[PDB]
Write a protein that binds this DNA or RNA. Structure first.
Ligand SMILES: [Mg+2]
Ligand SMILES: [Mg+2]
Ligand SMILES: [Mg+2]
Ligand SMILES: [Mg+2]
Ligand SMILES: [Mg+2]
Ligand SMILES: [Mg+2]
Ligand SMILES: [Mg+2]
Ligand SMILES: [Mg+2]
Lengths: 286, 286, 286, 286
DNA sequence: TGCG
DNA sequence: CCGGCGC
DNA sequence: TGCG
DNA sequence: CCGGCGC
DNA sequence: TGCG
DNA sequence: CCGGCGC
DNA sequence: TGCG
DNA sequence: CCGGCGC
């Protein structure tokens, strides 16, 4: 009897395999590997073997794997988090955003004022130069919480009426919007330069919030500890990073005796900067 | 009224009145007012009248009122938040800490590593000069969450076992500590210089976290919108400020026709920077 | 006592003595000490003795000493920095900002846009609820650099004309404002809570600048290493702290056997977080 | 005679052309353009014509253009800044730092302590989890200042000896190392995701400094105002961005009547977020 | 080369 | 480090 | 189409 | 968005 | 009159 | 702005 | 205590 | 920690 989160984790991997997102080409290179690097090549191959990947196909265009990885991550989060309603109740929505959504975050309570800022800037110069446009934050995946009725708040006891706790964020109707619960950034693979946009997006969420900061996490299928470390090490922007196949990564590093990579892997794991994709749903329930 | 949060809000005010924390001296100065300040005096008197305050006594020493205000705010939050278990379940603890101990936050999961940094600085001077020492400063009041047993996670379904979600923060078992849910800073009265330690303490919680940022809020009995604004305006450090008698403050500003102060009050309230103490328990449930 | 900076340092101390800013009251408490604190009391008296202080006077009101300390520090900086024209040329101005605080900062190039932000907010609601108000920063003392004419830029060679380097900050020309060189915060004495406004003011200068960040320093007469450390330890907001009588503080710490204070003193000094007032003029020439 | 800075700007451009860094391929795509983007293609062609580019050759590998652009920008800054000794005297060094040099930054005074942090982490595995690792990242190009002899400080008057201003940063004494004057980040072209490492690197310089923050700027050859805005808008990390051919960009934007892009250009330029490469040497002299 |  | 290009 |  | 690969 |  | 002193 |  | 009050 495999527990349900183990079953969900396997379903997550299976979607990556069935869609040929994770596969091997005819030159033996696994699709999340950097073929110019011996350790990346071998680590990725070991992980794919542990995942029972058998398909041989050409590496998909990066735009395709990028988008598909976001979608599959979203489905896994939605399905697993749904089972935690008893430890973190709520009317939750999980969705892949899509760069098409400029100001999508302004539809949520903690960032609704960005609409007013944007509207004011579209009429004022150094307002625009000073405020910027990055505040136009667009997470890859977001988890949101819908507001609740007074009868839900009062389900067991008469706690509130219309003249008390009148600005509480959870109360529906104050002309109020849903709450942003989490920003989940996805990276199929990593290069240390381009991975830093997870930090700038995290800082924008920190700097502009009105209310509690959403969870800010990164999920990645990057095989190398060194590249993972470019976003996982350090604190202040990113809450934690989650690897798509942590157990398998650990097993391959141990098997091949890649001592330095192993040392770095444990610095991140023991240092609470890196976890497995299966840890994410429960971490979203704190 | 009869809603329980309304009763609890009154119990909070009554504790302040009964302990002479909020009282009026024989010169007519209410104890949360700046007697040299005309508007402070009048706004504070208006609020005391709406709270039905009648006791005449000398102002208590600032150390006494500061500590009592923290204690009374702690009791209000504990009492009210306990009623929201169906909206935000968990084994919650609310406690007044402050200077009773430094590095108290290192007792919690997201800041556990500060103990190691302090030990390292203890053996290497420099580290101390670069790392600083203020990361050891404890919030006036903290709300914490104890960890969960597998029996509870698996209350309705078989979700986890020892080989899946092994790093999830909520799971009890590997020396992992409880989670810090909220930092609640209290200020009986405000001066714009000394109010800024709430921003530096908030920034330290932001910069050093591993995991989701706790709620970071300030509760105050300061009567003037100008002084309240010295900590409520701006974003990035403080989630929101909660006033001890917001409805009364609004009413008196209207009655006195202090138009500029009323305008600032509304900028803060409509701008989601200022709410009533009764909004805090529900805001801790998002 | 031959070199001019040594003579200037002595003049600085003499102004503090002559104005009764630094004096000893009837209870033997020196005016920069906390009489309830044995270490503060003894350290401050030792320093006063090394400065050859003999005046007895009751302690000046804090508003008076705060303002006088700012004025005297400003005069020391102006006089000493004036002698470094050969290593840091320019048309420099040093001034205690004072009462006409708000937006003086916006007269300078790197922060001129703050005026636009303030005007916009005035004509409309929230904006200030997001943007805040503390950005109308008012440093205690500022050092500014006036702009240069082409004749000077082209003193030795024909480097520029009207069609090249047209946006260079240093070029005098309708529209261009003087540059803010330094923000010098003064604190006659310190309490750990109120000292934090130096960090928030420093962060505002960092976050809102257009151009190179000005020097951000703090000058203080606080006698105890513990209180000095509440602003000197750590990095990110304050470049460095300068003590009004560092050599004397070190000598008395050596004589008194307060080993924890001596250790803290050296962590800050060896750690480049604390220097002497005489180091400031040269540090402003980098 | 054309001004020497105008002549320097032309030499800068000539080096880009002679090395085929900036050229046009046989399909009409200029080497700093995004061939798939009509507006990018046209703007880049317009600029190339204004620089009188006539060479037809295939685009160089990105690694090649990236390194060459760094080298060429370094040579321009060194040559032009050397002519400003009368406005900003000193013993200056300008050098392209190879990604082949981590902790080169710790060779400089304001960041020397990073070596001690790195050694502490090497023996305290785990500390790296919190401290991070990128704090060892060195800028693409750095400008540094050697320390000054007391002979020069005392050139005209006897200002200092060994018992006064003993911790001054400029004094070639306290084992003190040279000072970091500027961090110059280069980007031949931009994509909004990879442009963000300039912000994370800038933040590391802000957060870890002891002393005055160095200049932090970006130089780019990106043709589109939209992509330039991904790094130029906003304040706090980057002092200002400098475009390799600003005058030409503006001219072609007008000739093609790209209204939105022109609006954005002026917002960045009037908003002091974007200047010409010719403005950089003088801006480094403030 | 490795990784920016 | 930058370039290509599919969603 | 343009752009993450 | 990710992938290739030269300094 | 009220910030610092 | 700084000072006093109960916590 | 000295400090928050 | 807050209170007093000069500038
Ligand atoms: Mg994204
Ligand atoms: Mg992504
Ligand atoms: Mg506190
Ligand atoms: Mg407090
Ligand atoms: Mg000040
Ligand atoms: Mg001051
Ligand atoms: Mg670089
Ligand atoms: Mg670069």
């Amino acid at each position: 009897m495999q527990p349900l989160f183990t079953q969900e984790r396997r379903i997550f991997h299976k979607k990556l395999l069935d869609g040929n997102i994770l596969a091997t080409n005819n030159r033996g290179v696994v699709s999340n590997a950097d073929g110019s690097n011996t350790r990346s090549f071998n680590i990725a191959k070991g992980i794919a073997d542990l995942l029972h990947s058998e398909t041989v196909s050409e590496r998909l265009p990066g735009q395709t794997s990028g988008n598909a990885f976001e979608a599959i991550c979203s489905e896994f989060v939605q399905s697993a988090f749904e089972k935690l309603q008893h430890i973190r109740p709520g009317d939750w929505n999980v969705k892949q955003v899509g760069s098409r959504n400029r100001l999508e975050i302004a539809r949520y309570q903690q960032y609704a004022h960005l609409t007013a800022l944007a509207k004011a800037a579209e009429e004022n110069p150094e307002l625009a130069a000073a405020l910027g446009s990055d505040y136009t934050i667009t997470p890859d995946i977001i988890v949101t919480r819908n507001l609740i009725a007074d009868a839900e708040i009062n389900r067991n006891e008469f706690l509130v009426d219309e003249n008390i706790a009148t600005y509480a964020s959870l109360r529906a109707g104050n002309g109020n919007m849903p709450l942003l619960h989490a920003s989940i950034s996805c990276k199929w693979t990593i290069r240390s330069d381009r991975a830093q946009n997870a930090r700038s997006e995290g800082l924008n969420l920190v700097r502009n919030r009105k209310g509690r900061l959403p969870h800010i996490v990164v999920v990645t299928a990057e095989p190398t500890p060194s590249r993972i470390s470019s976003i996982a090490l350090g604190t202040g922007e990113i809450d934690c990073v989650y690897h798509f196949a942590l157990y398998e990564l650990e097993q391959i590093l141990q098997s091949l005796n890649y001592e330095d990579a192993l040392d770095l892997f444990y610095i991140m794991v023991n240092g609470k900067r890196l976890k497995d994709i299966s840890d994410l749903p429960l971490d979203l329930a704190v």
